[PDB]
Symmetry: D2
Subunit: 318 residues, 4 copies
């Protein structure tokens, strides 16, 4: 029996026996994602080059912003693109808080590298006037999270309490088709991913760990290396093929470079729901209690045995 994102979402919403607000939020998000995908694949670029005789990042943010606001299901919106949290106008306020990166990896979208949209959805816990404080919740409180990868094909990975599900966007009918149910990451992978250009500033634990991947002390086969530079792409590969992804801290970046609210938490949530792990080295990403909507957080995620091994090395240096 064929399944679409819309049908899947409506059914889960029906089961929750609530107001149906989250369903509207997800539907709106889904539509925004297809709009972003269309723009990312350069639909209509011919008109830009004069066939008939301005930024993807900003457009992507506008799409998500507008779709979520008009869903009447949100009250506070945090975007990697805005300095301050956006407070939805009173007449369109819903009970959910959404943190997202409209177009992750857009910094290098010129080489046509894969890009994506990352998002995390929380329920406003407080009754107070909606404010940026409502987005300051530990990833452990997530109701739903996931991402859209605009790669060779467009896929939406959605994670909730019930697990992780992957949907493929069929451009012929603009429909997200369920192609992978209750996804689980491999217990152990054969691929490690991180920018080794930072080697000189690597934390000792990171240096030793990568060294064990290249020169396994047990003379087993070394891990292969992959680093796209776009978190969505690297994390998705990690989920599908298993392995480990790192963007750790160092003397010069005590807290890392990726952002906790809309990059680390959503990915940590997906990973844990898929049987994987996500750590800052000192603790689970999802347990970090944020104080700033844009605060950074180090992150090591992927296959459990691989993350556990990293933590072993980390511990050795603590």
């Amino acid at each position: 029996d064929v399944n679409t994102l819309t049908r899947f979402v409506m059914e889960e919403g029906r089961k929750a026996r609530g107001t149906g607000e989250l369903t509207q939020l997800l539907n709106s998000l889904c539509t925004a994602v297809k709009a972003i995908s269309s723009a990312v694949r350069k639909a209509g670029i011919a008109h830009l080059y004069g066939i008939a005789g301005k930024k993807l990042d900003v457009l992507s943010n506008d799409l998500v912003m507008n779709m979520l606001k008009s869903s009447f299901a949100t009250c506070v919106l945090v975007s990697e693109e805005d300095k301050h949290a956006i407070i939805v106008e009173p007449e369109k306020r819903g009970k959910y808080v959404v943190c997202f990166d409209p177009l992750d990896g857009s910094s290098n979208i010129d080489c046509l590298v894969s890009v994506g949209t990352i998002f995390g959805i929380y329920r406003k816990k407080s009754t107070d006037e909606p404010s940026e404080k409502d987005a300051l919740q530990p990833g452990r409180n997530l109701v739903a999270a996931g991402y859209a990868l605009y790669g060779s094909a467009t896929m939406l990975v959605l994670a909730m309490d019930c697990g992780v599900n992957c949907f493929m966007l069929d451009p012929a009918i603009g429909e997200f088709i369920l192609v992978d149910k209750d996804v689980k990451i491999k217990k152990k992978g054969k691929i490690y991913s991180l920018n080794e250009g930072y080697a000189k500033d690597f934390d000792p634990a990171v240096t030793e760990y990568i060294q064990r991947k290249k020169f396994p002390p047990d003379n087993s086969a070394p891990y292969g290396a992959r680093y796209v530079g776009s978190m969505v792409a690297d994390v998705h590969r990690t989920l599908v093929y298993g392995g480990i992804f790192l963007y750790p801290a160092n003397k010069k970046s005590p807290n890392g470079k990726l952002r906790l609210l809309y990059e680390c938490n959503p990915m940590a949530y997906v990973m844990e729901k898929a049987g994987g792990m996500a750590t800052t080295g000192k603790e689970a990403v999802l347990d970090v209690i944020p104080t700033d909507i844009h605060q950074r957080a180090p992150v090591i995620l992927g296959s459990p045995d691989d993350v556990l091994e990293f933590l072993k090395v980390y511990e050795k240096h603590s």
Copy 2:
């Protein structure tokens, strides 16, 4: 003035003052590429999952094979997908030889990583009955070469004697729009690309070179690292942002890992026509005379200053 791949090709062909055969070959290749793109983005996948109640690489190969044969411009076709060179039936024989990889990086297509089509076009040099020997020409004899990158967007890079030109596929009208005329690679980049998981087996010169990128002896800023795993993606990034890409021999693959005819030569041609370099370490990729259609070849390409620097290190270890 807007320009399309079709218009551009027809114009160049008109100037060459020939039979117009290459024009038909390129037109057919262009069509095959759009077909591949449509399938790679998963058009119609809903039907595969039962909305109404072959493998991508095989389909891709069929598309190119069929379009080239029916162009009446080719006589010998070598594909990464077929063990033997395909000899075009007599009634459809043209004077060109085409070596191509229908879907480069398809091995890791499950993670939605970028994939592409690489191609190299030669003029049949020998007058003997067409055979696999017609494809055994040094890259230096290429009439045209290039690739299609199916990434965030689909782009076709075409290289000829007159230079390199980039076209963006506008999905709205199925037209390749010229967006970058006479492209030239940066003299020097800030990114190095290669699978460092092979560190253990790297040749000494490669080890030292990478070491210089991470720990500049001149204490300048270290190069950033990126490795997608898909040659088309990695090479395209190198072209756009400059830098260097490597896939040198391993102690486990003494003759390199990438294939000379449909991976190395085409990319080397694009690089040289863009002002860059491509070497096996011992010589220019384009000068290697092939003896086997699927023989491997090491390859170091990218910005001239960067490749020259690698060659300096290489020499120091020779």
Copy 3:
């Protein structure tokens, strides 16, 4: 504030405060319509003609049939394509009955004339085992009805108790965009539509009426004539521009030619919810009590003043 078919449907469903079944049904139908649209515009026809080396009406029927069944919201399905009503297997039964024409006007599809999908939704009113009898309800009992016109662009007209709304399918993102809220037909039009090739067999009332349109009683300008041959196209034009559409009974077809359950009723419902009228001449189409799922019914619909005028002539001949 932008609105989509999905968002609109979910909102109306949320207000009805029911099980959410009709929502799932409509969502499923919407997806089927996009699939039909894609096939009607000939997506992938290149493969049919050998680029790489079933009938549209059958496919359309399969799409609707499969999407409805898998919605878990239907129990009885009547299609212009099937002699007998389809009874949904027990494990997929819902409380709705759907009568539809998968691809209206497909008989003359070879000329690329507009085609469409017509549908009428009823709630099973009985407590017995689902059967063909559940589809034999007067149009007056419709819960929702409408159609998809596959013309210059694809539009879905949906009618319910709250009125008529028009959605435009945006091929770029496969989303139905609301472009016309609470639509109302003109009180009086200037166009009449019917196959005048039947003149010889016309009922006297029809002859006189058409005569009044060509040679106006109040020396008013004559009505313009338009007859596409596809009910969906002709009816949609009547809705948008006002006027009147006819397919009356004659000497050989005393019960008309169009089918009551999936052609006449749906259109009559749309018309009345838009402030228009639909009559068989003797009574309102929606009041006819069917005895056979495929029975025919004459039909005169469109602007109220126009239909009333027809009825005046009709009565003069009774």
Copy 4:
């Protein structure tokens, strides 16, 4: 062996053994047609309705054709319904062809989603002087190529040349026109007549009698079915595929007809004749009319030969 518009055009151009200019012209036209199709199917309409928080379709269509032809470097004079005057291509972009076209026929009624299309006729500049409106004033008999794009349930491009008529289906998945009907020929006789009967009151006697014969056959044969979409491209295409007759004659009010000779009548007349059909004004073949004004009107009766001949018999009976 699969064939596309591009491959087909390039091959015919290669055969002609010329400069390759017409090939570039056709390529450019093909591209413009796909862009028009995309817009007609409402791609991106969501942005117009605020999904992220605008010119008329006929204007845009005209701009696309205009821009693509000019940049083809193959044209010198362009006539479109949109501009009162013929456009003279700037010297540095001049080619030897003259193109008359209707960017978006039937756009007067595009709100009801009725079929619309693009009609075009290509001539070779036959003068030695400075390009001017006068170069577009050639009888349809001089056409080098003509055809149309129908934006209906699907998008098809009908191309006619000396070698015959060929139909291409636009595959939206790959933006390619696929040849699906080679050397098309219209039925010798059809069973459908098409014209706006709302003008009955002003019909010329010959037209009145002819329509009368289709509804009430003399030999008591089966009457013809009636079809009138209101969009010339749709009505004409139906006529080509199913055979029959299409009419938009002159009457009392409209003495020289309503349709335009250069970009509506001539192109369709050329397609019809190359397909074995006919196109007459009643007094003579549409293609033989020598124009004096780029926007002059001309009556037109076209379709299956036997049907047109029959019309002409009635017409003569009233002359």
